[PDB]
Amino acid sequence: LKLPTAPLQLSGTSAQIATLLWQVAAKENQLDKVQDELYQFIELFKQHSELRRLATDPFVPTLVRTKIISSVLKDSGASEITKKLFEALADEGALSALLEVTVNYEELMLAHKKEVYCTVITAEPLDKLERVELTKKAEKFVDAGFKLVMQEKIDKKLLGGFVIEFSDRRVDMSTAKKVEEFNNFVNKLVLSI
Amino acid sequence: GELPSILSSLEVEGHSVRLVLEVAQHMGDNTVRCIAMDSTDGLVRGQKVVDT
Amino acid sequence: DAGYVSQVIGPVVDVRFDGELPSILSSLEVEGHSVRLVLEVAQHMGDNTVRCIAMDSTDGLVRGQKVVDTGSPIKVPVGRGTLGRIMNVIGEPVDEQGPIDAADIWSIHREAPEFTEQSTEQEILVTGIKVVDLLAPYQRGGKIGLFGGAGVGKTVLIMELINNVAKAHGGFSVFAGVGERTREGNDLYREMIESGVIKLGAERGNSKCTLVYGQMNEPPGARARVALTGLTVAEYFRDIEGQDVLLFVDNIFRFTQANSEVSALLGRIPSAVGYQPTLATDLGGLQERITTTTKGSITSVQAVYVPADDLTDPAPATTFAHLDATTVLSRSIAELGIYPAVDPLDSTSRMLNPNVIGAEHYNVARGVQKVLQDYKNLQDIIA
Amino acid sequence: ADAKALDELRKPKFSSKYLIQHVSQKLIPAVKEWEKSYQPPVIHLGRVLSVGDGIARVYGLKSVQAGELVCFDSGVKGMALNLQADHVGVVVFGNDSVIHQGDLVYRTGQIVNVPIGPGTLGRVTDGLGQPIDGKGPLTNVRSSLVEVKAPGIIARQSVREPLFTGVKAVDA
Amino acid sequence: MRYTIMVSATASDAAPLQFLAPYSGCAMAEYFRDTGKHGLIIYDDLSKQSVAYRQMSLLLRRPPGREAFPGDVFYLHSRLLERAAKLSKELGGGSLTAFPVIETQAGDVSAYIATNVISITDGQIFLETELFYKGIRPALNVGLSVSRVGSAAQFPGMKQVAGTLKLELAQYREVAAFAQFGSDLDAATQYVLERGARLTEMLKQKQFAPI
Amino acid sequence: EWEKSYQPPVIHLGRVLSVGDGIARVYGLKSVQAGELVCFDSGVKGMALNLQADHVGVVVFGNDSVIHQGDLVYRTGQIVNVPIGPGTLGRVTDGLGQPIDGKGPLTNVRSSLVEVKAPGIIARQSVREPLFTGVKAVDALVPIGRGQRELIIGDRQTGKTAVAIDAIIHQKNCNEQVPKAQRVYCVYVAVGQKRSTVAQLVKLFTQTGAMRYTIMVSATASDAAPLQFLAPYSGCAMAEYFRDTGKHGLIIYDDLSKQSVAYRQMSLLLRRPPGREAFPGDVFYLHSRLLERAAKLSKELGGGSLTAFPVIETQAGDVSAYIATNVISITDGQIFLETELFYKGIRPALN
Amino acid sequence: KALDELRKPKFSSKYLIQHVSQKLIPAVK
Ligand SMILES: Nc1ncnc2c1ncn2[C@@H]1O[C@H](COP(=O)(O)OP(=O)(O)OP(=O)(O)O)[C@@H](O)[C@H]1O
Ligand SMILES: Nc1ncnc2c1ncn2[C@@H]1O[C@H](COP(=O)(O)OP(=O)(O)O)[C@@H](O)[C@H]1O
Ligand SMILES: [Mg+2]
């Protein structure tokens, strides 16, 4: 009667599908099994046209929607957690709800691994010492014993330094911001003096 | 099978009264919109509905 | 780079974009239309989509048609050659004399002039109507309001005020037609070519007026921004040239109605009685741009149609805070056959004070107010 | 949960394909066992999702404009007043009882045009050009744009002609 | 009927055929303006065309406003009554003159459709149900009815004598309600009652009698 | 010593989904507080009023044509505050707390939170000593005590500003011959007036000399919606400074109906549920926590006072309109200023 | 290209999560 606890809460009626999906698959310990199975359906929704007609056509009746999905979903290695899921979305026309339920299941899976994104922008590419001096200030800016990925990036307008685009937080140690804030502390003291 | 034309009648089955419906809007979902001409107390969501 | 119209609902159309969405209050263009169509964005939908307002009629927009970005607000051509020209909202000639002989296009959407550059020196603008210059004396460079019902005589005061003050000034003026009839628009074009304010031939540069016309036929994109198009060419002649320019705007109420006709259509709940929820920043942003600064002078003349002589509707009840001198037209005094039918009680200006004009002006106008209030309190009991 | 995560979802990261080889083999017999329950994919035509009382909501119609006369499959004429994201709200000229969920909607392309001219002097049509006076169709006539904007300022002159009404209550 | 076209949208027809019928009604009459002739148009029951506009939008999931009428209903009646005009010399000199009909809701001049169409149109003719039973037929209100162009819009011989007609009617409407005392003083408070009453008894006529 | 104190901020983020009409709906901000003052990228501030499940609604203190979709908002971690203190005297600030006079910054000031609770029961002492306001029709007929609420209701063009400013000039005519403690300081808060009318009001407080005692908070009609919403709270937060210092203070809100037009304009834009005359339901609560902030503190908690003079502009004398119904209910009395008897020579037309 | 129509959720039956939950727990062993 107990479900495995969701690592972070979400919004409703389109993303808590993924919260419920994570609460089912982690009970079956099928976590990285079914997550890239959602990816294949997106490639099925990308390349093939007959399946992606079924996710947006408003004229197909409510029995051809389920009798193609359960016809396509034989065993084939596919999980019955996944097979009972994709039956349910074509049961109530929710086959358009796939591209949202994945990216929050992506978020919830990266919430199960303690594994946060970032994107660091410099003016200079990072060598094998410059990148390993970066993380020791970056891991002051995560809250706990988390992981860290790297998405190194080049832009000329920053004059050295970095900006850690956590997508939730940002730390500006770039000098182009520093010379801007140096100029604002010039003007706030030359006008007052 | 096929949704009937607008302002055509329906005949419900299984009610205590011979209750008749009249379709007015085809509300999508292969489902129409009716106004019941008699008492609606006792309609279950599976009752067979035939048209004239 | 550029995007497509994705959705059309009457006079508001929706444009999707593939990255780098346009800034708010910029200009959009559709190709393959009958006339050049300008879309002015008012809100972002959220899914890479700006929501617009249409300067001309949308009947003809296909779903998916090519929409380019000008990346910039609406540009009208300002200049000294613009005198003697009947101008649109989007910078067009609609008097059919070539292009506009001017340069240095300017953004017609801007911020208000600040608090530091405000003029407090007040000069009595003697007009020539015996109820104006005694009772509600106008201010040079100040604000002139005109309320009254539909059929009391508002617009025939306005052209009378043009003949009073816009001829005996010598400088420049601007007639900003915001959603009035073409009849009082076309007739004013003839009675300024014959009176010589607007000239034709090779004497186009010595004229005194530009006509910015957003009359009733246009959809409410054009009737909502012709107020600003007429305003910014007046604010162009103020800061660059320094001359005093008289802004003769007609039907400010039609500016606020043209906003309110699509304000519900952009996804907003209606306000009080059915007018727009954002009327305060719509009209308050309009009015305080029309001031007089240290650099020059703008003397605004505002006509407002009020519905059925009821001043409790909030669309003119925001305007009463926004007008120094107010010439409130009563239909009763016109039902008496008295023209001008200017109320001795409702119409009261800000110059009326003995600390500015002199006690000889203030005491008789107050002496007018004693004998005319008691005449109203006695004409009930005279029956 | 943003659009860059959606564009990252456009990059495939599946790491295995142990379904796609077989679901591409059972796709085509599935859609051709249930082939009779498929209406054809309709792009430059239209087909009705919802219909009622003079406002019929039509899927598709990538080619229409605002104010294009459309023709339903029973001969009923229509008008596209607004065009939503996925569907087009169509206003229905006349009685609307004949339109079902799944009927075809044909674009006529033009803006709505009612026959004009002097051959109509003596005829009573409705607002659509069809005669109701029982004297047959309109002869020596032509179509014109009913959505045309007014004549401009440079087009008008001062009025002079008094338009006598024949009523002393009016003309005096 | 030789010189009359009539577009006739009944109440038993759908809404947009009534919504388009004044629009198609002016599409005929723009031809008479374009080719130099003069055109008469009467947009009869124009409030009921606006109710024919209100039916379509409120099924169309569009936001309502005053009296559940939509936002742009001023723009409906605006371009319906702006395309009637008097052109210049350079396009034949043709004309169009407009008669919209707005029924008040038993005396609401501040009714939502009324305040639009009283502000668009140039002159109005009030017909109260009061004046229709005092013998005044047609029951024109004189003190409330205005025009724009005044002179060179009447018969010019009538134009000189109209000022003698209007201003004496102006005093008479002020003295007609002062009949609660029995005054008839100084041969003026009786004579302007004696004049304007015969002016009312002058200015009645018969239905369907073009003179 | 500024370079030696530069620790970079960790500051948390939020990205904007939809932005329009001075209302920006932001995504993210896992810890933003209710009514927290945020800052955008382009230097314009903002407050988040409502906080929903997925997106957070943020109202904007300024022009809104600078923010695209996908811009960033930084949380300042502080509920919106205004600089209070004596250095504000003579300055003309905007309602957020920045000066617009052109006189540089506001020095000898301290920032404090504009949103606190009113003084309770035991904070109060019964108002006994009187405030004197110069207009003899106010002082003798419908009198006003030091630490009291009195509503200057009226029409427009009728003198509601005149009853306000003639009280202010009377204080300058009273403060020069009264000792240091019981000197009544003025904060006339201009809501919804023009940017040129305040120019006349900055002149009359200078030319008479009252600008030694007056702070002119003028959120115009030209700025955005929440500045006209926040100008009474910040102006009463300026009146908070003169309360707990123990001095006596005069706080005047002018045309508080426009502040109701301010709280209407943001509420329907934020899709809060509308109530009577399409105002939000809680607009009576946002009028009361304003007007219950000015009172007389007792002899154990400071001894100072605070008397508030709100102004409601009616339409034709309807004292039962919904906005006037609220303010008459929370305030004590009424100084009804009718337009019709104003031309009957009784100045002010005090019915 | 082929995923622009799939970019957002769209469905009827705002209580959809309760529908799918009874169709996800059956395959729970
Ligand atoms: N004692 C007085 N004698 C003569 N005029 C006065 C007097 N008091 C006020 N007024 C008039 O009041 C007008 C404006 O004053 P004030 O701004 O106080 O009115 P108000 O009711 O606030 O108007 P609004 O609400 O439109 O701003 C001035 O034109 C002034 O002439
Ligand atoms: N001083 C005047 N002399 C002659 N006619 C006047 C005068 N003042 C007003 N009128 C009449 O009032 C009528 C309404 O004028 P107008 O300004 O068009 O009203 P509105 O602004 O309500 O449309 C005009 O037909 C005009 O003849
Ligand atoms: Mg005032």
Give the separation between CA E91 and CA E45, rounded to whole angstroms: 31
For the beta carbon of residue B29, count every other beta carbon within 10 angstroms. 14
Distance from CA of A46 to the nearest CA of B (A): 26
Give the separation between CA D74 and CA D95, rounded to whole angstroms: 11
For the beta carbon of residue A50, count every other beta carbon within 10 angstroms. 14
- Taking contacts as CB-CB distances below 8 angstroms, the residues of chain A near F72 are 170
Instruction: Assess whether F304 and F155 both reside in one domain.
Output: yes
Instruction: Assess whether C284 and C247 both reside in one domain.
Output: yes
Q: Note whether E100 and E43 are within 8 A (CB).
A: yes
Give the separation between CA A132 and CA A138, rounded to whole angstroms: 10
DSSP, res C206:
G
As given in the structure block, the two tokens for residue F11 are: 């500051």
As given in the structure block, the two tokens for residue C133 are: 């210059």
As given in the structure block, the two tokens for residue B46 are: 């599976």
Q: Which residues line ligand 2 (CB under 6 A)?
A: C 150-156, 339-340; E 146-148, 150
Cα distances (angstroms) measured from residue A97 to each of A24, C246, C290, D13, F285 = 18, 60, 52, 19, 42
Q: Note whether F251 and F288 are within 8 A (CB).
A: no
For the beta carbon of residue C230, count every other beta carbon within 10 angstroms. 29
Distance from CA of D95 to the nearest CA of C (A): 24
- Among B3, B5, B30, select the one facing D97 at the smallest CB separation: B5
- Taking contacts as CB-CB distances below 8 angstroms, the residues of chain C near E79 are 216-217
Q: What is the CATH number of the domain that holds F165?
A: 3.40.50.300
Cα D140 to its chain centre, rounded Å, is 28
F30 and A168 within 8 Å at the Cβ level: the answer is yes
CA dihedral D147, D151, D153, D157 (to 10 degrees): -150
| C101 annotated to bind ligand | no
Q: Note whether F158 and F337 are within 8 A (CB).
A: yes
DSSP, res A121:
E
User: Quick check: is F174 in a domain?
Assistant: yes
Distance from CA of G24 to the nearest CA of A (A): 6
Q: Estimate the crossing angle of helix E73-80 against helix E46-59, to 10 degrees.
A: 140
- Beta strands D55-60 and C244-250 are unpaired
Distance (angstroms) between ligand 2 centre and the Cα of C154 equals: 7
- Tell me the β-bridge partners of F48: F36, F58
Sole residue written with tokens 């390349």: A47
DSSP percent split of chain A into helix, strand, coil, nearest 5:
45, 5, 50
Distance (angstroms) between ligand 1 centre and the Cα of F157 equals: 5
Q: Note whether C209 and C84 are within 8 A (CB).
A: yes
Domain count, chain B: 1
Instruction: Assess whether C45 and C183 both reside in one domain.
Output: no
For the beta carbon of residue E11, count every other beta carbon within 10 angstroms. 9
- Tell me the β-bridge partners of A79: none
Q: Reading across the β-sheet that carries F216-219, which strands appear in turn?
A: F92-93, F216-219, F184-191, F248-254, F307-309
- Taking contacts as CB-CB distances below 8 angstroms, the residues of chain G near D10 are 3
Distance (angstroms) between ligand 1 centre and the Cα of F342 equals: 10
Cα distances (angstroms) measured from residue F270 to each of C200, C260, F264 = 52, 18, 10
Sole residue written with tokens 């001894």: F303
Closest residue in chain D to residue C59, using alpha carbons only? D66
F9 and A172 within 8 Å at the Cβ level: the answer is yes
Give the separation between CA E83 and CA D156, rounded to whole angstroms: 11
Own/partner pairs for F48-51, CB < 8 Å, 24+ apart? F49/F266, F49/F270, F50/F270, F50/F272
Sole residue written with tokens 């957020």: F96
Cα distances (angstroms) measured from residue C55 to each of C29, C291, D112, D153, E77 = 11, 27, 22, 17, 18
Instruction: Assess whether C191 and C254 both reside in one domain.
Output: yes
DSSP, res C23:
P
Give the separation between CA C249 and CA C143, rounded to whole angstroms: 11
Burial class of C181 by CB neighbour count within 10 A (0 to 12, 13 to 18, 19+): buried
User: Quick check: is F238 in a domain?
Assistant: yes
* Angle (CA) A157 A160 A164, round 5°: 90
* Angle (CA) F113 F114 F120, round 5°: 95
| Phi and psi at residue C249, to the nearest 5° | -95, 140
- Tell me the β-bridge partners of C209: C173
DSSP, res D22:
H
Give the separation between CA F307 and CA F143, rounded to whole angstroms: 12
| Phi and psi at residue C89, to the nearest 5° | -80, -35
**What are the strands, taking DSSP E only, across chain F?**
14-20, 23-28, 36-39, 45-51, 55-60, 74-79, 81-84, 92-93, 110-113, 152-154, 184-191, 216-219, 248-254, 307-309, 311-313
As given in the structure block, the two tokens for residue F222 are: 């030209």
3-state secondary structure of F27: strand
Residue where a domain terminates, one of F49, F78, F107: F78
Domain that holds residue B26: 1-52
Q: Note whether C302 and C144 are within 8 A (CB).
A: yes
Q: Note whether C150 and C303 are within 8 A (CB).
A: no
DSSP percent split of chain E into helix, strand, coil, nearest 5:
45, 10, 50
Q: Count the helices and strands in chain D (H runs, E runs).
A: 4, 9
CA nearest F181: which of F105, F102, F266, F248?
F248
Q: What is the CATH number of the domain that holds F24?
A: 2.40.30.20
Q: Count the helices and strands in chain F (H runs, E runs).
A: 7, 15
Using CB atoms, which chains have 3+ pairs under 8 A with A? B, D, F, G
Ligand 2, residues C129, C156, C329: which to mutate, most atoms within 8 A of Cβ?
Answer: C156
Which DSSP string do the residues of F201-238 spell out, in sequence order? HHHHHHHSSGGGTB-EEEE-SSS-HHHHHHHHHHHHHH
Instruction: Assess whether C46 and C132 both reside in one domain.
Output: no
Q: Estimate the crossing angle of helix F322-330 against helix F283-291, to 10 degrees.
A: 30
As given in the structure block, the two tokens for residue D155 are: 């087009």
Solving technique: cryo-EM
Q: Note whether F36 and F47 are within 8 A (CB).
A: yes
- Tell me the β-bridge partners of F23: F20, F59
| C370 annotated to bind ligand | no
Give the separation between CA D118 and CA D122, rounded to whole angstroms: 9
Closest residue in chain A to residue F70, using alpha carbons only? A167
Give the separation between CA D170 and CA E140, rounded to whole angstroms: 8
**What are the strands, taking DSSP E only, across chain A?**
121-122, 153-154
Give the separation between CA B28 and CA B30, rounded to whole angstroms: 5
Q: Does C382 touch chain E (CB under 8 A)?
A: no
As given in the structure block, the two tokens for residue B8 are: 């055509």
As given in the structure block, the two tokens for residue A25 are: 């698959």
Give the separation between CA C132 and CA C125, rounded to whole angstroms: 10
CA nearest D105: which of D40, D61, D51, D62?
D61
E97 and D163 within 8 Å at the Cβ level: the answer is yes
Q: What is the CATH number of the domain that holds D80?
A: 2.40.30.20
Give the separation between CA A68 and CA D27, rounded to whole angstroms: 8
As given in the structure block, the two tokens for residue F243 are: 């309360």
Sort residue F328 into left (φ over 0), alpha (ψ -120 to 50) or beta: alpha
Which residue puts its alpha carbon closest to atom 7 of ligand 2?
A: C339
Which DSSP string do the residues of F97-149 spell out, in sequence order? S-B-SSS----S-EEEES--PPP-STTB----SBP--S-HIIIIIS--BTT-B
Q: Which residues of E are catalytic?
A: 148
Q: Note whether D10 and A45 are within 8 A (CB).
A: no
As given in the structure block, the two tokens for residue E198 are: 């015969």
Domain count, chain F: 2
CA nearest A100: which of F163, G3, D161, F6?
G3
Give the separation between CA C221 and CA C54, rounded to whole angstroms: 5
Q: What is the CATH number of the domain that holds C322?
A: 3.40.50.300
Give the separation between CA E121 and CA A70, rounded to whole angstroms: 67
Sole residue written with tokens 């309001």: C145
- How many CA atoms lie within 13 Å of F285's alpha carbon, on the beta-carbon side? 5
Distance (angstroms) between ligand 3 centre and the Cα of F317 equals: 15
User: Quick check: is F84 in a domain?
Assistant: yes
Give the separation between CA C220 and CA D139, rounded to whole angstroms: 39
Q: Note whether F272 and F285 are within 8 A (CB).
A: no
CA nearest F100: which of F91, F108, F109, F90?
F91
CA nearest F114: which of F241, F216, F218, F213?
F241
CA nearest C145: which of C369, C284, C319?
C319
How far apart are the two ends of chain B, measured CA to CA in Å?
14
Give the separation between CA F62 and CA F76, rounded to whole angstroms: 17
Q: Count the helices and strands in chain B (H runs, E runs).
A: 0, 4
Show Cβ contacts of residue D120 under 8 Å, excluding neighbours closer than 6 positions. Answer: D138, D141, E5, E28
Show Cβ contacts of residue A148 under 8 Å, excluding neighbours closer than 6 positions. Answer: A116, A118, A135, A138, A139, A142
How far apart are the two ends of chain C, measured CA to CA in Å?
76
Give the separation between CA A139 and CA A142, rounded to whole angstroms: 5
Q: Estimate the crossing angle of helix C252-263 against helix E73-80, to 10 degrees.
A: 120
Sole residue written with tokens 């020196």: C121
Q: Note whether D77 and D110 are within 8 A (CB).
A: no
Give the separation between CA B15 and CA E74, rounded to whole angstroms: 51
- Beta strands F184-191 and F248-254 are parallel
As given in the structure block, the two tokens for residue G28 are: 């729970």
CA nearest F328: which of F117, F148, F143, F149?
F149
Cα F250 to its chain centre, rounded Å, is 13
Domain that holds residue F153: 79-351
- Taking contacts as CB-CB distances below 8 angstroms, the residues of chain A near G28 are 24, 27-28, 81
Q: Note whether F336 and F351 are within 8 A (CB).
A: yes
H helices of chain C, where?
132-135, 155-161, 183-193, 222-236, 252-263, 279-287, 314-317, 331-335, 359-379
Q: What is the resolution of this structure in A?
A: 4.3
Q: What is the CATH number of the domain that holds C56?
A: 2.40.10.170
Instruction: Assess whether F186 and F332 both reside in one domain.
Output: yes
Instruction: Assess whether C120 and C201 both reside in one domain.
Output: yes
Which residue puts its alpha carbon closest to atom 15 of ligand 1?
A: F159
Cα distances (angstroms) measured from residue B1 to each of A62, B45, C278, C342, D47 = 12, 18, 51, 73, 18
DSSP percent split of chain B into helix, strand, coil, nearest 5:
0, 35, 65
Instruction: Assess whether C251 and C153 both reside in one domain.
Output: yes
Closest residue in chain C to residue F204, using alpha carbons only? C120
CA nearest C11: which of F214, F217, B23, D147?
D147
DSSP percent split of chain G into helix, strand, coil, nearest 5:
15, 0, 85
Ligand 1 pocket residue status of F258, Cβ below 6 Å:
no
Give the separation between CA A45 and CA C244, rounded to whole angstroms: 66
Q: Note whether B34 and B22 are within 8 A (CB).
A: yes
CA nearest A177: which of F71, F41, F78?
F41
Q: Note whether F161 and F169 are within 8 A (CB).
A: no
Which DSSP string do the residues of C219-267 spell out, in sequence order? -TTHHHHHHHHHHHHHHHIIIII--EEEEEEE-HHHHHHHHHHHHTTTT
* Angle (CA) F303 F307 F309, round 5°: 175
Cα distances (angstroms) measured from residue E32 to each of C19, E3, E84 = 51, 12, 11
DSSP percent split of chain D into helix, strand, coil, nearest 5:
15, 30, 55
Give the separation between CA C69 and CA C22, rounded to whole angstroms: 7
Instruction: Assess whether F136 and F251 both reside in one domain.
Output: yes
Instruction: Assess whether C29 and C161 both reside in one domain.
Output: no
Burial class of C100 by CB neighbour count within 10 A (0 to 12, 13 to 18, 19+): buried
Instruction: Assess whether F65 and F94 both reside in one domain.
Output: no
Burial class of D29 by CB neighbour count within 10 A (0 to 12, 13 to 18, 19+): exposed
| Phi and psi at residue C252, to the nearest 5° | -60, -30
Show Cβ contacts of residue F317 under 8 Å, excluding neighbours closer than 6 positions. Answer: F155, F338, F339, F340
